[PDB]
């Protein structure tokens, strides 16, 4: 409703860096809000795409941002009569970024890895890797939980069980208020998908450079399965956290699996021990139900609610014809120990191929009425197909069925305006929570400032 669509702020990165593929707000130890932006195709030292991360100070004028520097050199360690190798070329550093406390977590889902023992090899595979930085102190650390040293022949004997070679850890990410990093790895367990969790503090204390393979005892990975319903499900395509069991000491995980059960798609709510509490099934196959998940209390009853995006849902229309538009599902948490029922509200896109629901950002309470609100992205929507971000306001019964404000892309065609979103943070310190929108196709990020209600 009360985002300012007239005077925007534009931050920008190098041409073709996909600056804005991922973003988040970052408060330093003093509370000053900056913007962290990942550019997964930034050039490295060898003039090869390795990705990059930028830390943007808040200025109403926007502009260029300084880099958040990470190591981009390939590593090699000859240890244990073996040879460990990391390959950062086209790793996509900055394909997901997330902030917690004064720490930034930027991930390279496609960082490759291999191990050589004489003539055998583990196979050069994309295990993924996340880089962690404390910008004020200059501390750095890495976390790559899927790196292994098992040779290729072994996996064949055991029928590829516990195969974490293609995890792409860091594909999606989130951090619990307690400070436990949670990485989605959609390729883990031969493309079933796994999650990896580990306290940020322990990642730093257990990391040393050049070790490449180290233990993080306090970590916790999800589990392989022999159930074909999970096969090629990309469990961990998206991740989020919330409170869903009534126990405030436990933190619950929400996982997207948009190709679960033969592309039916699914979303699962688990406890911290990866035990399944509820499961939401996709409504339509290949709709990619689970592409994005969002957790926020929208009806002001204190119980977090669940939103799931299915950006390729095909809506029924006259004459038995369908139309890919995308759909968003709202699930309201019921009082006490009970299962999440049918969706309380269905939001469906309008523009063909618009991919409504590609991203879903909790906004907090935008208009300050006591009900939290959300923003939904249709990165190829609007009458021009340039992209649209739609705001829906919370109410006592859930959300409003019609949007309160629509943001049209200020970029040219192909910018993927809205492909990444992030809200619920007050960046100019005017008492109102603001919205940052990524448009990696245009290598820019747009900041919308919330203003008092008119």
């Amino acid at each position, epitope marked *: 409703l009360n985002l300012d669509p007239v005077q925007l702020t534009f931050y920008a990165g190098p041409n073709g860096s996909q600056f804005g593929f991922s973003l988040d707000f970052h408060k330093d130890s003093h509370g000053r809000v900056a913007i962290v932006v990942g550019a997964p195709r930034t050039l490295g030292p060898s003039q090869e795409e390795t990705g990059g991360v930028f830390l943007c100070p808040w200025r109403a004028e926007g502009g260029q941002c300084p880099s958040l520097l990470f190591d981009l050199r390939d590593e090699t*360690r*000859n*240890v*244990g*009569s073996q040879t460990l190798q990391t390959f950062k070329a086209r790793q996509g550093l900055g394909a997901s970024v997330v902030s917690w406390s004064d720490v930034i977590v930027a991930c390279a889902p496609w960082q490759h890895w291999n191990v050589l023992e004489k003539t055998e090899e583990a196979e050069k595979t994309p295990v993924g890797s996340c880089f962690l930085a404390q910008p004020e102190s200059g501390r750095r650390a890495e976390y790559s939980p899927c790196r292994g*040293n098992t040779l290729s022949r*072994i996996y064949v004997e*055991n029928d590829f069980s516990w195969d974490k070679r293609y995890c792409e850890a860091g594909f999606s990410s989130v951090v619990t208020q307690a400070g436990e990093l949670v990485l989605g790895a959609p390729g883990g367990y031969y493309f079933l998908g796994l999650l990896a969790q580990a306290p940020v503090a322990d990642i730093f*204390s*257990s*990391y*040393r450079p*050049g*070790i490449l*393979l*180290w*233990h993080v*005892s306090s970590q916790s990975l999800s589990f392989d399965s022999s159930n074909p319903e999970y096969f090629d499900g990309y469990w961990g395509y998206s991740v989020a956290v919330g409170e869903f069991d009534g126990d405030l000491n436990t933190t619950e995980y929400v996982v997207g699996a948009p190709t679960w059960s033969w592309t039916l798609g699914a979303v699962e709510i688990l406890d911290s021990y990866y035990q399944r509490l509820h499961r939401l099934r996709g409504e339509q196959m290949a709709s990619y139900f689970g592409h994005s998940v969002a957790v926020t209390d929208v009806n002001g009853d204190g119980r977090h609610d669940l939103l799931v995006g299915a950006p390729l849902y095909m809506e029924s229309r006259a004459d038995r014809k369908l139309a890919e538009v995308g759909r968003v599902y709202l699930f309201l948490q019921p009082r006490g120990p009970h299962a999440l029922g049918a969706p309380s509200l269905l939001l469906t896109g309008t523009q063909l191929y618009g991919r409504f629901g590609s991203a879903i950002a909790p906004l907090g309470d935008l208009d300050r009425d006591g009900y939290n609100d959300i923003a939904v992205a249709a990165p190829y929507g609007g009458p021009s197909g340039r992209g649209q971000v739609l705001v829906f306001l919370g109410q006592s019964e859930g959300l409003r069925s019609r949007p309160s404000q629509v943001l049209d892309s200020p970029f040219p065609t192909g910018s993927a305006f809205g492909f990444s979103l992030r809200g619920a943070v007050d960046i100019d310190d005017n008492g109102y929570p603001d919205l940052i929108v990524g448009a990696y196709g245009a290598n820019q990020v747009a900041v919308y400032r919330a203003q008092p209600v008119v």
Partner: antibody
Amino acid sequence: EVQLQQSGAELVKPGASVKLSCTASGFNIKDTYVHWVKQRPEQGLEWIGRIDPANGYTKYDPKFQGKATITADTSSNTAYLQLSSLTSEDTAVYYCVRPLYDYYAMDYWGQGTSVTVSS
Amino acid sequence: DILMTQSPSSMSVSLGDTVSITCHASQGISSNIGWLQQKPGKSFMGLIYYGTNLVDGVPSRFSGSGSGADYSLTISSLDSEDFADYYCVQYAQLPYTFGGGTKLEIKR
């Protein structure tokens, strides 16, 4: 905390066999590699072998192939070292080792199991 | 196998001294070396891993250094507890091999 509690001292005859134990305390034995190291006053320290208790795969120094047999039961969270056809030269102190962070290191050590072979 | 020549075999020193133990390998091991301590009539405790990194709980007066095939363990200001045995172990290749050992003795 991480502690490796081994079996009591053993007192055996030549030609017999013995099975030492290394029980994990404060962690899961399945987490890391588990090595076995032999110590003598003259010959010093010698590396016997290792095992990955998650899968049971083992590596050995060619010097101990035949005498040393390393196993692991994740149920009782314990790693074992079996020695066969014992000899006066097999009289030594035996330690189980695991790394702290580095997959390949040798950082945490059990107290050591004393072995004496004699008729 | 990789031969670990550790030197010296022993040294007579006093409290507060700054001493250095060395370890020479038959070939390069690229900092894949650990250092160990065995207080008299007791077990082992880890000091260094990957050449320079302190094991959690070890005082900062310890410090490892070196590269290629020549490494060093240094103790700044000896404490009464530091009089013990010290060994170097390489894990660059299987089988792991240990150095001869170094005993720190009180000087008088």
